[PDB]
Ligand binder design. Structure first.
Ligand SMILES: CCCCCCCCCCCCCCCCCC(=O)OC[C@H](COP(=O)([O-])OCC(O)COP(=O)([O-])OC[C@@H](COC(=O)CCCCCCCCCCCCCCCCC)OC(=O)CCCCCCCCCCCCCCCCC)OC(=O)CCCCCCCCCCCCCCCCC
Ligand SMILES: CCCCCCCCCCCCCCCCCC(=O)OC[C@H](COP(=O)([O-])OCC(O)COP(=O)([O-])OC[C@@H](COC(=O)CCCCCCCCCCCCCCCCC)OC(=O)CCCCCCCCCCCCCCCCC)OC(=O)CCCCCCCCCCCCCCCCC
Ligand SMILES: CCCCCCCCCCCCCCCCCC(=O)OC[C@H](COP(=O)([O-])OCC(O)COP(=O)([O-])OC[C@@H](COC(=O)CCCCCCCCCCCCCCCCC)OC(=O)CCCCCCCCCCCCCCCCC)OC(=O)CCCCCCCCCCCCCCCCC
Ligand SMILES: CCCCCCCCCCCCCCCCCC(=O)OC[C@H](COP(=O)([O-])OCC(O)COP(=O)([O-])OC[C@@H](COC(=O)CCCCCCCCCCCCCCCCC)OC(=O)CCCCCCCCCCCCCCCCC)OC(=O)CCCCCCCCCCCCCCCCC
Ligand SMILES: CCCCCCCCCCCCCCCCCC(=O)OC[C@H](COP(=O)([O-])OCC(O)COP(=O)([O-])OC[C@@H](COC(=O)CCCCCCCCCCCCCCCCC)OC(=O)CCCCCCCCCCCCCCCCC)OC(=O)CCCCCCCCCCCCCCCCC
Ligand SMILES: CCCCCCCC/C=C\CCCCCCCC(=O)OC[C@H](COP(=O)(O)OCCN)OC(=O)CCCCCCC/C=C\CCCCCCCC
Ligand SMILES: CCCCCCCCCCCCCCCCCC(=O)OC[C@H](COP(=O)(O)OCCN)OC(=O)CCCCCCCCCCCCCCCCC
Lengths: 56, 459, 121, 140, 99, 87
């Protein structure tokens, strides 16, 4: 009956995986707008000894 | 915004692949989850908006509307469960698909960052609403209601498209941030007057404005319960959001062109309240009350002061919730007696106590009982109008008196008195209906507790 | 007609040799994904019209629909990118060639610029 | 048509009201003749006399509308001493609409014609002032 | 008569076939679980968790920051005898009037 | 624009601080407030006048550019008044 449970309740993962995919796509879009990262007059800052990017 | 957009486009295949007896459960559960996810957008900044990407951005004005839409979807699903028992599986799935598409289009409309994409989505919302009305309405007048709604909206909005493309050609971009930073004053000439007329008239027909409002009673009376819930709560706020967005580029001409619309809106408040005083249909009463509240929001937007925008946003949210609750109560009463006449069924407080309590609370929120956000928005708008001029106080006072009059009149007519003797099919209220009313009413009181979340970006 | 008659234009050529200097679209392009989605929708509509199980019948023909749509969309995207690149190249060339028609203007700060103030009351 | 429009525009706005009315009457008569020709071509008259009567009725209606519009607009502009004002054209258009309603013996037709003709005449005057063009020459 | 039309059916009562009906579905188990999921998710999760989340949302509007900055500026201004609020937002030295 | 908005919020909070001072002084003095708490009234008058002159009726779409335009207009008016006085 475990297969029947999966065969009937497999649609309950669609929205969670869609949320995860949306978060991933939001991060991937945010990575394309890094032209002024650590370059603004207000937030320009020397990097920490163990650091390469101010934000991701 | 993709973290909210994608789950709706996943609601679609989930709805179409779910079992015949699980569609409502799955849709409601995942709509509630999406609403919970969308609650995170309330963490707005104080100076600039949240710019997720080149296409979508969120502001202190967009966030409450998105939360309201995502919260309103499951309530519409519950109402659809109520009135669609005998429908076939495919038609029920189509109804849920229409609701989901409407919610997705509304979310994208509220989060759009450019005026042309905003227009495209704001016009895309017409198709699902028209289909829902003209397909699942109960009476003959649904076709006429759909025609009136569609043609009023399109006749309003086509000159808006012409004006938008002209503005893009003239200035360079329709991006909201650019048109706000690079805004320049609008000279007082006939061409500028007509561009102002195009944009404002589009959003006023959508609002609606008094004299351009017959489509609202026609569509709201004849629409099904879910259609009425989405028409009154969210679709009416597209005009207000657009006006609060489009007026950036219309100054200082707005200081000169606002007089006819201000007079129309105030006298329309008065006239529609008086109409509410003598309505034989409950849904018509609720629709005209919605018209009056939207006219007040129009007055706030047109006077265009920092104290008027906060009141406008608060009143929009409060009116959406209150009108949805009122329509749900009226639909329960209709489904009990299969008639929309108000004086047909009486003694409903004797027959159904808890529904009488819900009616009392909804009518108290409608007449702006303090400290509700309805009253907060109305009082801010009244104070801004008083600063604008000192007879608007007279008009607002008489409007408020008539509003209280007709709210308590409908309450006393429906709930109090002697029950109709020959109506013997008044079954006890369902847990579903009680939960629907509770889910409508509790967020209003919570927003009363925390009012700074719905006061717009000028807070 | 704007682009037609451009010097060096070979007639009836979908993609000339100069179009190969541009980055080809990625196979994970959102436009390609949308083309595949259109193909899948066309397959579902085919099943619905021909009265077959929509989501489970004709998997091979649904795959063929998706593949054909992706193929044509890829080539269409290549041509579109080439045309836009050509337009930008011509625009920049003309701007370079006509400096008197496209002159630089003085940049005055807002401290120097006088603009009228219209009170809102 | 271009020659008649050029004559009408070359006659000054606030002056020469008789010549302005004559130009408007000529334009209206030409429009009425064209409409009569199309009406006879599409819906044939019973007899030659009936066709002549229909042509005369249409031409007289159009010429009366044009003359009333021109006279009213020019007289209003002259008496108000305020040329380049769309209100004069609006008054002339409503007067022409009322003339059409009187010719057709219909109060509702007269009122609707007054409203629409006044609105479109005001639009025409605003376009003349602001430089609006209906059939724009290809520019970009 | 003008059509071969079915008569209008009588409306069904959910309480007749199920006195414990919650009004969601005519199937008892489906109705019970629909009520349970609606109540649990909506009320508990959305109301309580979203309400406390909004209550404890971080102060990104900088209200407390603005209050602290105002206190600091007031202290510095009144300590040195300077006016609490400046006459102009910008510097007239940097502003060049047309003349 | 961001800097100007932060300054605007800080000025609003300064006005709030002065108003709190005035309210507390009135309540504390009680029956003799019209004379005792007159020092807070003058400070509040000065702060309110300066705040009104700066962020006066700029509208719901206020911006640093609009505030700069208002300041330029006020400066021109003051210069013209001074010239017509001492000229
Ligand atoms: C007709 C009687 C009339 O004029 O009533 C005016 C009265 C408004 O009171 P008001 O403030 O005295 O009128 C304007 C002031 O006189 C003068 O106002 P102002 O000096 O501030 O200048 C503003 C004026 C600037 O003047 C102009 O722009 C003149 C040129 C107008 C060109 C045509 C506009 C076409 C689109 C209009 C909307 C169509 C829908 O704006 C207008 O004229 C806007 C006209 C449209 C207003 C909105 C109408 C919505 C529908 C109403 C219900 C319809 C049923 O009612 C209406 O305007 C609605 C009449 C509906 C019939
Ligand atoms: C079994 C399945 C097997 C295949 C599974 C997928 C395999 C590939 C997975 C993958 O990683 O792909 C990479 C690719 C993303 O790679 P990327 O380069 O990182 O892209 C990130 C940014 O999007 C990059 O943004 P961007 O700056 O490059 O430009 C983005 C956007 C810029 O343009 C826009 O943002 C405008 C988009 C709307 C335009 C039309 C609006 C008005 C009409 C709407 C309704 C139309 C009729 C329906 O332009 C486009 O995306 C052009 C094509 C638009 C097609 C989709 C949107 C239109 C239909 C919306 C329906 C609702 O993944 C996708 O594109 C997947 C999207 C779909 C996910 C499935 C769930 C549905 C979501 C619907 C969202 C609607 C909004
Ligand atoms: C560049 C390419 C094009 C070049 C074109 C060059 C043309 C050169 C032509 C040279 C000669 C061609 C020779 C062969 C012609 C063959 C004609 C033929 O077969 O006709 C058979 C055709 C029917 O044959 P049927 O069925 O055996 O006979 C039955 C009866 O016709 C039944 O009749 P009924 O008496 O029982 O009643 C019916 C009658 C009823 O007709 C009437 O009642 C007519 C009443 C007219 C009253 C007019 C009052 C005002 C007078 C003018 C005032 C202004 C003057 C200045 C205007 C211009 C200013 C710039 O309907 C007709 O007569 C139908 C035809 C006329 C329809 C009205 C429209 C005419 C349009 C003319 C041009 C308009 C341009 C636009 C307006 C511009 C305004 C500025 O007969 C007729 O149409 C009757 C007339 C026949 C002689 C026509 C001679 C002229 C032809 C041109
Ligand atoms: C100079 C420049 C001129 C440019 C052209 C102007 C004219 C354009 C339109 C001409 C044809 C109109 C249609 C027609 O003949 O309808 C009657 C004819 C017969 O109608 P019916 O069925 O006997 O009417 C039944 C009534 O109960 C019958 O009732 P009833 O017998 O009692 O009739 C009396 C009553 C009721 O009449 C009716 O109900 C029907 C009578 C005709 C009505 C036409 C309505 C459309 C009006 C078109 C013109 C508007 C203005 C154009 C621009 C003017 C610019 C100044 O009232 C009237 O007839 C009043 C007529 C008013 C005429 C216009 C007055 C304003 C003149 C212009 C302004 C003046 C001031 C200027 C100041 C400066 O219609 C048809 O057979 C079917 C019509 C639909 C299909 C038409 C297909 C062809 C269309 C061609 C259009 C022209 C194209 C030219 C360029 C081509 C380039 C390739
Ligand atoms: C609905 C409401 C629509 C409202 C539209 C308002 C437009 C305002 C902005 C444009 C403007 O003011 O232009 C005027 C224009 C301003 O420019 P401008 O600086 O004077 O001259 C420079 C250019 O030459 C100015 O030239 P343009 O660049 O504007 O373009 C010139 C072009 C275009 O001509 C014009 O622009 C001259 C006329 C302008 C006034 C038009 C008034 C009516 C509104 C028409 C709107 C477009 C309709 C769609 C296109 C037409 C085809 C259907 O071509 C010509 O003039 C000659 C070539 C032939 C043209 C077509 C002639 C045949 C038309 C046949 C129509 C048939 C309809 C049948 C319907 C029924 C079917 C069954 O002034 C004139 O043309 C002088 C007009 C003097 C008399 C005025 C009489 C007013 C009467 C009012 C009451 C009418 C009651 C009718 C019953
Ligand atoms: C917008 C501002 C107001 C402009 C609109 C004015 C309309 C006023 C009310 C209409 C007149 C009252 C009336 O009943 O119409 C008379 C009657 C309508 O026929 P009924 O048999 O009565 O059917 C009922 C339709 N309502 O006549 C009409 O309205 C037809 C309109 C006449 C056409 C005139 C158009 C002239 C063209 C202008 C150039 C463009
Ligand atoms: C947003 C809020 C709402 C705002 C808008 C509210 C509505 C405003 C407009 C109301 C209607 C006004 C009249 C419009 C139509 C007039 C023509 C008409 O009604 O025609 C039909 C009728 C035909 O009559 P008939 O069939 O011949 O015979 C029957 C009796 N004789 O004709 C008649 O019987 C003729 C009767 C004429 C009586 C006088 C009418 C006076 C009023 C109209 C003119 C108003 C002008 C206002 C100007 C303002 C300028 C600033």
């Amino acid at each position: 009956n475990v297969l029947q449970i999966v065969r009937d309740h497999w649609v309950h993962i669609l929205v969670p995986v869609g949320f995860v995919f949306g978060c991933y796509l939001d991060r991937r879009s945010d990575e394309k707008l890094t032209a002024f990262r650590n370059k603004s007059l207000l937030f320009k800052r020397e990097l920490r000894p163990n650091e390469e990017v101010t934000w991701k | 915004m993709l973290k909210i957009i994608i789950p709706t486009t996943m609601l679609l295949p989930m709805t179409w692949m779910s079992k015949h007896n699980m569609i409502w459960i799955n849709a409601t559960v995942h709509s509630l989850l999406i609403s919970l996810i969308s609650l995170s957008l309330l963490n707005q900044l104080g100076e600039n908006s949240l710019n997720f990407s080149l296409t979508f951005f969120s502001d202190s004005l967009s966030a409450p509307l998105l939360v309201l839409t995502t919260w309103l979807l499951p309530l519409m699903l519950m109402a659809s469960q109520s009135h669609l028992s005998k429908e076939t599986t495919t038609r029920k799935k189509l109804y849920i698909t229409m609701l989901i598409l409407l919610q997705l289009f509304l979310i994208m409309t509220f989060t759009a960052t450019e005026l042309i994409l905003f227009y495209i989505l704001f016009e895309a919302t017409l198709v699902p609403t028209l289909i829902i009305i003209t397909r699942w309405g109960n009476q003959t007048e649904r076709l006429n209601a759909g025609l009136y709604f569609l043609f009023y909206t399109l006749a309003g909005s086509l000159p808006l498209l012409v004006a938008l493309v002209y503005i893009q050609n003239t200035t360079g971009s329709l991006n909201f941030l650019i048109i706000h930073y690079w805004s320049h004053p609008l000279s007082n000439s006939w061409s500028n007057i007509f561009m102002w007329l195009a944009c404002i008239m589009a959003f006023m027909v959508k609002m609606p404005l008094y004299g351009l409002h017959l489509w609202l009673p026609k569509a709201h009376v004849e629409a099904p319960i879910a259609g009425s819930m989405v028409l009154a709560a969210v679709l009416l706020k597209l005009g207000g959001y657009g006006m609060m967005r489009i007026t950036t580029i219309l100054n200082p001409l707005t200081n000169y062109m606002a007089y006819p619309f201000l007079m129309l809106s105030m006298w329309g408040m008065i006239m529609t309240s008086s109409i509410c005083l003598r309505q034989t249909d409950l849904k018509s009463l609720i629709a005209y009350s919605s018209v009056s509240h939207m006219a007040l929001v129009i007055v706030a937007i047109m006077i265009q002061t920092p104290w008027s925008f906060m009141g406008a946003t608060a009143l929009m949210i409060a009116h959406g919730l209150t009108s949805s609750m009122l329509f749900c109560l009226a639909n329960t009463n209709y489904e009990r007696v299969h008639s929309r006449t108000m004086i047909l069924a009486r003694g409903l407080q004797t027959l159904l106590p808890l529904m009488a309590t819900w009616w009392l609370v909804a009518s108290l929120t409608n007449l702006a009982l303090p400290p509700s956000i309805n009253l907060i928005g109305e009082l801010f708008i009244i104070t801004a109008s008083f600063s604008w001029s000192n007879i608007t106080i007279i008009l607002m006072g008489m409007n408020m008196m008539i509003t209280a009059l007709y709210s308590l009149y409908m309450l006393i007519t429906t709930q109090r008195g002697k029950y109709t003797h020959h109506i013997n099919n008044i079954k006890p209220s369902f847990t579903r209906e009680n939960a629907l009313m509770a889910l409508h009413i509790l967020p209003l009181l919570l927003l009363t507790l925390n009012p700074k979340m719905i006061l717009g970006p000028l807070y | 007609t704007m682009m037609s008659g451009r010097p060096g234009r070979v007639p009836l050529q979908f993609l000339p040799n100069e179009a190969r200097s541009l980055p080809p679209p990625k196979l994970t392009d959102p436009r390609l994904v949308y083309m595949g989605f259109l193909g899948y929708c066309s397959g579902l509509i085919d099943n619905a019209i021909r009265r077959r199980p929509v989501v489970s019948a004709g998997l091979h023909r649904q795959l063929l629909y998706v593949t054909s749509f992706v193929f044509f969309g890829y080539y269409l995207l290549k041509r579109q990118d080439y045309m836009y690149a050509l337009r930008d190249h011509d625009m920049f060339a003309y701007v370079k060639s006509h400096p008197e028609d496209f002159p630089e203007k003085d940049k005055k700060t807002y401290g120097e610029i006088l603009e009228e103030f219209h009170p809102v009351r | 048509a271009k020659t008649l429009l050029h004559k009408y525009s070359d006659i000054p706005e606030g002056t020469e009201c008789h010549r302005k009315a004559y130009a408007s009457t000529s334009i209206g008569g030409a429009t009425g003749l064209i409409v009569s020709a199309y009406s006879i071509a599409l819906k044939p008259p019973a007899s030659f006399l009936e066709g002549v009567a229909r042509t005369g009725r249409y031409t007289f209606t159009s010429a009366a509308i044009g003359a009333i519009f021109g006279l009213t607009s020019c007289i209003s502009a002259q008496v108000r001493e305020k040329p380049d004002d769309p209100l004069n054209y609006f008054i002339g258009g409503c007067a022409g609409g009322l003339t059409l309603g009187a010719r057709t013996r219909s109060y509702g037709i007269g009122a609707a014609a007054c409203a629409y003709m006044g609105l479109t005449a005001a639009l025409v005057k605003m376009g003349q002032l602001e430089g609006w063009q209906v059939f724009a020459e290809p520019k970009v | 008569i003008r059509l071969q039309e079915d008569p209008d059916p009588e409306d069904e009562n959910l309480y007749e076939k199920n006195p414990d009906s919650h009004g969601y579905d005519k199937d008892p188990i489906v109705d019970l679980w629909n009520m349970r999921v609606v109540f649990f998710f909506g009320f508990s999760i959305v109301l309580v968790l979203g309400s406390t989340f909004v209550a404890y949302l971080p102060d990104y509007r900088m209200q407390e920051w603005a209050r602290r900055e105002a206190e600091r500026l007031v202290k510095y201004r009144e300590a040195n005898g300077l006016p609490l609020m400046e006459s102009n937002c910008f510097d007239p030295n940097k502003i060049q009037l047309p003349e | 624009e961001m800097q100007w908005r932060r300054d605007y919020k800080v000025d609003q909070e300064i006005v709030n601080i002065i108003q709190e001072r005035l309210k507390a002084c009135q309540q504390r003095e009680g029956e003799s407030y019209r004379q005792n708490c007159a020092k807070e009234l003058e400070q509040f008058t000065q702060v309110s006048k300066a705040f009104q002159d700066r962020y006066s009726d700029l509208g719901a779409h206020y911006s640093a550019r609009k505030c700069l335009a208002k300041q330029k207009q006020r400066m021109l008016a003051e210069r013209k008044a001074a010239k017509e006085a001492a000229a």
